Design a protein around this ligand. Sequence first.
Ligand SMILES: Cc1cc2nc3c(=O)[nH]c(=O)nc-3n(C[C@H](O)[C@H](O)[C@H](O)COP(=O)(O)OP(=O)(O)OC[C@H]3O[C@@H](n4cnc5c(N)ncnc54)[C@H](O)[C@@H]3O)c2cc1C
Ligand code: NFU
Ligand code: SF4
Ligand code: SF4
Ligand code: SF4
Ligand code: SF4
Ligand code: SF4
Ligand code: SF4
Ligand code: SF4
Ligand code: FES
Lengths: 419, 281, 343, 255
Amino acid sequence: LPITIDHIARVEGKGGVEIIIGDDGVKEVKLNIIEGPRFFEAITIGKKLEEALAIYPRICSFCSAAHKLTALEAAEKAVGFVPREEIQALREVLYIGDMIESHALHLYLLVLPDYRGYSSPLKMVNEYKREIEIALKLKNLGTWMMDILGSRAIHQENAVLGGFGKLPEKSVLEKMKAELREALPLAEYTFELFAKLEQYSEVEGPITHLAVKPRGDAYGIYGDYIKASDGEEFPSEKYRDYIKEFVVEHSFAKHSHYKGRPFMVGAISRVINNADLLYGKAKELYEANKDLLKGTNPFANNLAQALEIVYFIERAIDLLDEALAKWPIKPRDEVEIKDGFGVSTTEAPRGILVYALKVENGRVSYADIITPTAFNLAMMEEHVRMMAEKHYNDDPERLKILAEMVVRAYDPCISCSVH
Amino acid sequence: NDNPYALHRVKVLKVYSLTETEKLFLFRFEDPELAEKWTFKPGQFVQLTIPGVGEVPISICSSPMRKGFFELCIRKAGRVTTVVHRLKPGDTVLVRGPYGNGFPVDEWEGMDLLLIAAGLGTAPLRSVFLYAMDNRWKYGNITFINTARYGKDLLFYKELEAMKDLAEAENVKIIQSVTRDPNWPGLKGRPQQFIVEANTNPKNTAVAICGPPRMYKSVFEALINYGYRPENIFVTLERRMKCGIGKCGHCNVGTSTSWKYICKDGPVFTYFDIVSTPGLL
Amino acid sequence: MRYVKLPKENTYEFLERLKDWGKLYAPVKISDKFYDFREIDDVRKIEFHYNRTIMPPKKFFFKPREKLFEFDISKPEYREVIEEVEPFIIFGVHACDIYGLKILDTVYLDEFPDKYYKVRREKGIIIGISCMPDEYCFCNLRETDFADDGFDLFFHELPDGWLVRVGTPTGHRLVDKNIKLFEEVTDKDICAFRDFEKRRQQAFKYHEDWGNLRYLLELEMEHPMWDEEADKCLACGICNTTCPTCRCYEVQDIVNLDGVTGYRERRWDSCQFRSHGLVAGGHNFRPTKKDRFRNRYLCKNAYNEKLGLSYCVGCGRCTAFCPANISFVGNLRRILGLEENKC
Amino acid sequence: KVRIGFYALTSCYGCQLQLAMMDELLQLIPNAEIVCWFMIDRDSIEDEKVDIAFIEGSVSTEEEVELVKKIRENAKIVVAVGACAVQGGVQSWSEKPLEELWKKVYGDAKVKFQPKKAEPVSKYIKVDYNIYGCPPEKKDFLYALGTFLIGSWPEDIDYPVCLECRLNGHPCILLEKGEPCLGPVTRAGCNARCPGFGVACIGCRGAIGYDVAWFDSLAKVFKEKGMTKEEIIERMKMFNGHDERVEKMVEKIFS
Ligand SMILES: Cc1cc2nc3c(=O)[nH]c(=O)nc-3n(C[C@H](O)[C@H](O)[C@H](O)COP(=O)(O)OP(=O)(O)OC[C@H]3O[C@@H](n4cnc5c(N)ncnc54)[C@H](O)[C@@H]3O)c2cc1C
Ligand code: NFU
Ligand code: SF4
Ligand code: SF4
Ligand code: SF4
Ligand code: SF4
Ligand code: SF4
Ligand code: SF4
Ligand code: SF4
Ligand code: FES
């Protein structure tokens, strides 16, 4: 009889993986996603731009500001408008805060209790008070940045094309700078805590890493040219030519392949790709821990997430210091919604998020959504097969919990995979 | 001290299951200083407050001479009332002071009283009946008519039937009748059908009415057809109340000519007030 | 009362010396054409000539969202959350707003004095400013154009400065302390003040007597105008939540996650909302939308025998801020028959 | 301790995450015990009898249909949380058939499981109380949880977002710029977040119940600003998609 998980905990979706076995060990791995279809690629077809764009963040909620930022970039590319540098700096601050919140929430709430032997974060309210308190402070910093800029932590609605509905004041931004300064030592604590953590060697192997070239002089989520381990480079609009998508029969979510082979995306897939542009304390930390951050073990994703948290805290401090210069700032820019086409492949805390829109006469005629969860599920299947090949004769509970460990190390957003 | 919204602590002494949908409660304030000085006029209501739920008004149905004790007949028809129904004797509730003007019993002395209660409104009329009985010397023959519509919902039916012989001995005609219970072994007919048999002399009779205002028109017509004085008719009407001190604004009655507020201009009204401003009923 | 002349070069200096006493609340810009009472930090942002505020000055004494008590379920006790407030100076209160504050004083300090309202009314300085009638203001119809009591200072605008009527104590104290910046009036400014008052009276859009509205409104309780305007009404309560003389509020209980701690919250509630006149069993004493609309009209057209003024002060906030642009004065004059005159 | 379960249907997990972003959740552990919160707890029992069931997400699968029926059978008070579980959410915005959407998105591909047209939870099982929002406000979560823990139930709200918009003092978007703000017909509790930040309300908390949602007057005032009938209808039903009253109310004023 096949081994199947009814519901994988601490993962942004409902459903589990199915493992079939025979005389030759594990035969095939079938990820089952009973999360119902949401049709976010079609429910906005023919609808107005402003109405459709505000409901796109509802695909998930761990980083809905990433979805709103990507959608705003796609819309401003289709209309062919580029906001001012201070507006882009503020949107970068919003993106950095939401990436901080998502990565910290993942690393602490979801995967940390499993390594320390806890089923729920409510178990460690007293026996792990320091770590959970630092987790709460980092998550609250992200949430307060979201409430200041995007007006809400979940399902953001302040972000609009051309700027913002109402910017905060100078003292609020200075308090944001002070809070980031205070929280940088907590980010260092998080990086140390995840660096002193072990990684399983039962699944190590060659991995193809996908990322984008940062749109700047240093590491950044904004990017145009997608970069890979083999050095392949292509523009953002040429994503369909290389990455191919198809639908499997064992999950509502779509499937992806690269050069006929599954590929893995994540924090490691960006760090080990283009960490040469890093700066700050994260650069020294990466140089020190380069031995641990090998492009072979998928469990280095958590370490890469923590390192990127620290680096983006430094980048947020720098960006806010730069944005304090351009004061006073107009709230938003207003532009007529002209016909056009545009895409956006801005990076996400989980990987590379692909958004494509085609607006005709102020109404979104065409829209395709590809998410990092669908990007890395293909190699998630390969990794769970590899790790179950070493434990198929072991206890079913132990192989189930190890598969849970590897899938949560992949950091999936299941309801992002099903659009 | 000077805070008008302030409350006082009171504990339920005894619960008495009156009917299926109503329950009677006995109260006494925890503070002896408040208990020894608290007093009220028959007809004034109390802002009962369940901690953490809300404040509801219930008319006092006890004798004002019994200092430190009062009774509240409450029916479970909603959220706060449902929470109230679960309160056991020996539990805590916050109660605000009496509000409004009670029935004009001070002006009433010696004349005959026709206390006609319908439905739920028996409680203020029960209070005035108990007040009159406690000072029976200063009143004439009194007729207390309590009516209901489901037969079993005759509030305080046992108490009245127990005192029926003594009431007949003391020139008191207590009448209980049902409106929609042909099979109930008792009196059938509307309250108007039974006020025609009133012992009160219409020349020197004061009348107090309570209950649903849809029967108010019929009882007014029946009373005025028999020669009863319209200057001695007083009724009680209920509206939404959340403060009791004239600031909530929910209990607004009347028209632009006379825009009364029940917590300050009642809840005991007058016949010419009722017929003067349409919409009160 | 003393008349003290304030030349226009000393107005901001007087405001700066006024900020010495306490917090200053003056109308400032919040949008393109919206005014509100915001706390003053920089004095130059104050707009002296403003049509009307989006929220009446009753928010300082009758706060929009006030925590009355905080309670503990175990050992049931309610603790009144009242904080000491330093004397604040409300600068730029119209005559209509001053009369509204007087009406709310007669409503809230009568018989049972509300502690929360009284503690804030006893520590406030009202500074009246002579307004200029726009296309909505009808303070002359309801007789709220000029006030005698309630203000400790009255800034009457002059071509060469501001005429300050002290009127009440502590106004004398402020003026005497800052008498270096102040001057003395003569006929030169008195004639100009009289001419300005004449122009202000002549600039009103409406000029007719409204003596018998309260009586005739009951005769025409079932007008088809009520049905038509109610069907045009949106039932959003903006006409009451921005009204300066609406005493209504809603009391709600909020309990925390522990199940033992919580607080009681008070906020302004309008007639248009369903649960304003609801009793048990789903019975509503103004069920239909036209019923609540007429209830609001009749209630605002009531009579306050304490001071002889109708509760409506003619500020025009209800007609201006109504999204459906339902004219209060137009409807009420149509009740008289100035628009139809069919009978 | 009240037995509380959070059952996840097809949703963005915004409601659960918002319930997790509030620090007051630490105080809920002493006062109540959780049976099913899979995103937080691993040892959750998915079939245990519970007292209060907080249902999150819309019904878009036959498995979800049998799940919500099992929830109704195994719970005393069923609470629908969020627009997805109260009125279908944004998952039921499109009126096109399920086959059309499947052809548009997945083409001719076939999956082992069976999809379903998105519907509100009220269509299948009897919901008792709602916590409105998208995500529901932390104020609403605090209020409903505390009221349930006391032993009473929260009351349905009938006041529009304009109540908190006028209490907070935010300028009115409709009277100033004429943007399509759904304030006067959507329940409060969000403290006027969108008009506070200068963006028009998009029906974030759903239409007011008890037939006190006058869509005809709002459609008229939108028409006076120049919006076409179809534009107004599309502006509404974004979160009120499966409401049969809206179409009739709008066609009455555009008759
Ligand atoms: C002057 C007066 C005297 C009363 N005397 C009695 C009495 O002797 N015995 C008795 O059983 N009932 C009496 N009632 C009715 C009693 O107050 C209501 O049954 C009770 O308030 C219902 O509250 P609820 O929260 O359960 O109803 P909900 O509808 O859930 O709450 C609505 C709220 O409105 C307010 N309210 C004020 N008046 C009423 C009303 N009449 N009906 C409903 N809500 C109201 C309360 O604050 C109540 O919480 C009286 C009412 C008034 C106004
Ligand atoms: N793409 C994407 Fe996700 Ni399921 C969102 N929102 C990553 O967390
Ligand atoms: S109505 Fe009169 S007092 Fe009120 S703001 Fe207008 S001009 Fe000033
Ligand atoms: S402001 Fe206008 S639309 Fe809104 S409730 Fe008042 S009268 Fe009706
Ligand atoms: S108009 Fe309505 S809200 Fe205003 S005071 Fe009268 S009843 Fe209260
Ligand atoms: S009814 Fe209108 S004009 Fe009269 S006081 Fe209220 S808001 Fe001002
Ligand atoms: S109700 Fe709103 S926040 Fe909750 S899952 Fe649905 S879209 Fe997300
Ligand atoms: S901006 Fe929107 S929510 Fe605010 S008052 Fe105007 S219509 Fe109502
Ligand atoms: S204003 Fe409207 S859209 Fe914005 S949060 Fe509130 S209900 Fe949702
Ligand atoms: S009892 Fe509160 S206003 Fe009348």
